[PDB]
Amino acid sequence: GKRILLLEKERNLAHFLSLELQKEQYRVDLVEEGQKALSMALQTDYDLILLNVNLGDMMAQDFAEKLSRTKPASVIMILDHWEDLQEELEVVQRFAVSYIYKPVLIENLVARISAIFRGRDFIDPRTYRNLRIDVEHHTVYRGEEMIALTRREYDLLATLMGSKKVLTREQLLESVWKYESTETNIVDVYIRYLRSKLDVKGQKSYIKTVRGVGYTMQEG
């Protein structure tokens, strides 16, 4: 059912991951170059794109930016060595739904992919202040400009906007990282990223930190 685009620079690992993911009944398209991966992701809606930090002909960050122009909520996961991921950690957190270290254990990869899919599917209010949300296409517009929220950022905004009450970090973790089974610090990171996308200098932020409680949407 679900469709995976896979670009892995280690050939034997690429072949192993392709075969093992197909045993889970995923359709897997293996590609060797970033330019080809981008052309395919532009024409097909993949449920997961699994890449290294560097695709060879371009960085994953560059791939993700180019894809985001038309598919901003694309679901990208990064598999790489610890050193390579940590060298690009802030960048990766800002475009990738998740990351996983080499050497990979296949049972762990399979479990994490399943959780990511189920957290998106469960998720899958149309205005707030100057924002308009297109829930069918997972797109957000602040005025006549598209705001290129990532999948995680979109899911976080939808959770905040869908709740009349203030939400704790633990509630936001359970909604936006559903099925992934504990550290709420990640919520604070993605709140920071989301504010960076939505907020206008000299306006009140779109997100209020509520003392002793959590986060909620904020009026102008």
Numbering used by the authors: 2 to 125, 134 to 190, 192 to 230
What does the literature reporting this entry say, word for word?
Here we describe the two-component-like orphan response regulator RitR (Repressor of iron transport Regulator) as the archetype of a novel family of peroxide-sensing transcription factors in the pneumococcus and related species. RitR contains an Aspartate-less Receiver (ALR) REC-like domain, which retains the common (α/β) fold of canonical REC versions, yet lacks “invariant” residues in its catalytic pocket required for typical phosphotransfer, including the phospho-accepting Asp residue crucial for the histidine kinase-response regulator phosphorelay.. Here we show that RitR regulates pneumococcal iron homeostasis in response to cellular peroxide concentrations through its single Cys (Cys128) located within the linker domain of the protein.
In further support of our activation hypothesis, we have included an oxidized mimetic (RitRC128D) structure of RitR. The RitRC128D structure was sufficiently similar to RitRC128S to enable its solving via molecular replacement. Of note, the major difference between the RitRC128S and RitRC128D models was that no electron density was observed within the RitRC128D peptide QHDSLMKV, where “D” would be the position of the wild-type C128 residue (magenta colored region in S3D Fig). Although the RitRC128D structure might not be reflective of the actual oxidation state of RitR in vivo, the lack of electron density around the Cys128 Asp substitution does suggest that changes in oxidation at the Cys128 residue would be sufficient to destabilize the linker region, thereby initiating downstream structural rearrangements. Aside from its unstructured Cys128 region, the RitRC128D oxidized mimetic mutant maintains virtually identical hydrogen bonding and RD/DBD positioning to the RitRC128S structure, with the two (RitRC128S and RitRC128D) structures having an RMSD of 0.35 Å (219 of 221 Calphas; S3D Fig, compare colored and grey structures). Conversely, the C128D oxidative mimetic strain demonstrated a marked repression of PiuA protein levels and piu operon RNA levels, even surpassing wild-type repression in the R800 genetic background. However, the C128D mutant was much less affected by aeration, where no comparative lag was observed and the cells surprisingly attained an optical density of over 0.4, approximately twice that of wild-type. Indeed, with two oxygens in its structure, an aspartate substitution would more mimic the sulfinic state of Cys128 rather than the sulfenic.
